[PDB]
A paper describes a structure:
PPARγ is a ligand-modulated transcription factor belonging to the nuclear receptor superfamily. It forms a heterodimer with retinoid X receptor α (RXRα) to play key roles in metabolism and the maintenance of glucose homeostasis through modulating numerous target genes. Sequence analysis and crystallographic studies reveal that PPARγ displays the conserved nuclear receptor domain architecture, comprising of the activation function 1 domain essential for ligand-independent coregulator binding, a DNA binding domain (DBD), a hinge region, and a ligand binding domain (LBD). The LBD binds a number of endogenous ligands, as well as facilitating dimerisation with RXRα, and contains a regulatory activation function 2 (AF2) region which binds coregulators in a ligand-dependant manner.
Residue numbers in the entry:
A (entry chain B): 206 to 270, 275 to 461, 466 to 476
B (entry chain A): 204 to 262, 273 to 476
The structure:
């Protein structure tokens, strides 16, 4: 509607984005390049550095367990569950979300967290590795693909997406509106009242379009390129669940399986 | 109406919202079925062997006492899945050590099932089959030994617990307090667990004061009910040790077995 109101929505989403996500992209980019404050993350590049990292980095997912490739997949599921709760808190700050049907709120989050997890995973990724444990570590890309089959292929697609996605050079204020657009997708299966969802998303898309033009004046059709990335996000989520269904045939704890019943 | 009350009320609203999304049969719906004030919510009442056989196909050639006991396990296992889903929504729960998350769910899931079971109970019986059925207290008490002495401690607690007249918004915070118990055996980090419960205990005190202003010291009486919950769990595990050695042709559900392992 009003151009000034769209900037108010952009400022609101960014303020909530900071409160909901501790390790922002700006903080992650400072770690991946050097914030002139030392505190460089512990790098995991092989099996020996991984065993040293577990004795130094405070890992809160070390259950009595036997192969190494399972532990790494276990750690990435612990963080995923933490991420879902961060996204859920952020989704509640989107204007109009809490007023939606309660079943629709659950549906929008059920199918949206995966696409948001990979979107924000790109903020912690360069072409050589990904930050882990709130930025205290850095697991190299070569060490991830050196894992045995099929555990050596569940991160390479995210790297291929991140290197293309990070080329857009979006900051946290851009991602805050972009993440809100993904959550309010009116085409999620099982929605009961699509109209208010699309109404809010069309309002978020107007805010994102004005945000990208003011924050990236020299990027011609960046708004269009960012919408094309949403298509690539659903391709990986579909590709990941196919690899996830291969899992459950190899990892064969009852109470632990209920906490991680998804993803 | 200070700023501290704002966060406590926000925490109460968050938990109640997660409570509704995690449990499909709330106390409000349970009471609307039992009070019998409509026509579409009337349940089928099972009171003898005849009405038991009459109420079939409610959306094996086993013994009646065995078949009903097997049905209690499936609902218990399904309840563990719902409590596990609600636990992840408690702020800070998924950020704790993974072994502590399992330990809190291991010892907390019993005290919550019997707490919410009171919502489905009155003086004369308990709702079953998602509220479509209603099994009387005397029919369950008439089952062969020792299957007839399973539900009596639960009915006695429910009658005294329901006298507090708590609604779902009160139960949402009280259930969160039960999960974040820092006295569970085998915990690694008690300080982060006690910090979360102190916040939940603070939110429960304000919730009960605003929702039950005429009820004097309801917060103290609600906390004292933990003694009765512990007594039921102790009596329940003693009975299961009898069936384990008398009914060697059946076993508990694997998810239930892991909960009962050790303590
Ligand atoms: C803590 C786990 C504990 N579970 C119970 O003690 C229990 C018993 C009966 C319950 C319930 C919980 C609940 C939630 C309901 C609604 N019921 C009534 C009910 C519902 C459906 C039906 F088919 C028959 C019914 F009796 C348990 C552990 C191990 C083995 C068996 C049970």
């Amino acid at each position: 509607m009003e151009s000034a109101d769209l900037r108010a929505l952009a400022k609101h989403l960014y303020d909530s984005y900071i409160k909901s996500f501790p390790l922002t992209k700006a903080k992650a980019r400072a770690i991946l390049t050097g914030k002139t404050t030392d505190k460089s993350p512990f790098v995991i590049y092989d099996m020996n550095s991984l065993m040293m990292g577990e004795d130094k980095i405070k890992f809160k997912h070390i259950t009595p367990l036997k192969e190494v490739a399972i532990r790494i997949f276990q750690g990435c599921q612990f963080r995923s569950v933490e991420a879902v709760q961060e996204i859920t808190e952020y989704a509640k700050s989107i204007p109009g979300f809490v007023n939606l049907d309660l079943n629709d709120q659950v549906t929008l989050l059920k199918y949206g967290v995966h696409e948001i997890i990979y979107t924000m995973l790109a903020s912690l990724m360069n072409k050589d590795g990904v930050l882990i444990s709130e930025g205290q570590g850095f697991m190299t890309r070569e060490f991830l693909k050196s894992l045995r089959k099929p555990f050596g292929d569940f991160m390479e697609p995210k790297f291929e997406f991140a290197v293309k996605f990070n080329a857009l050079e979006l900051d946290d204020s851009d991602l805050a509106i972009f993440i809100a657009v993904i959550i309010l997708s009116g085409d999620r299966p099982g929605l009961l009242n699509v109209k208010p969802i699309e109404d809010i998303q069309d309002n978020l898309l107007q805010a994102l379009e004005l945000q990208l033009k003011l924050n990236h004046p020299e990027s011609s059709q960046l708004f269009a390129k960012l919408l094309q990335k949403m298509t690539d996000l659903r391709q990986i989520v579909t590709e990941h669940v196919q690899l996830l269904q291969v899992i459950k045939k190899t990892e064969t704890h009852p109470l632990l399986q209920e906490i991680y019943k998804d993803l």
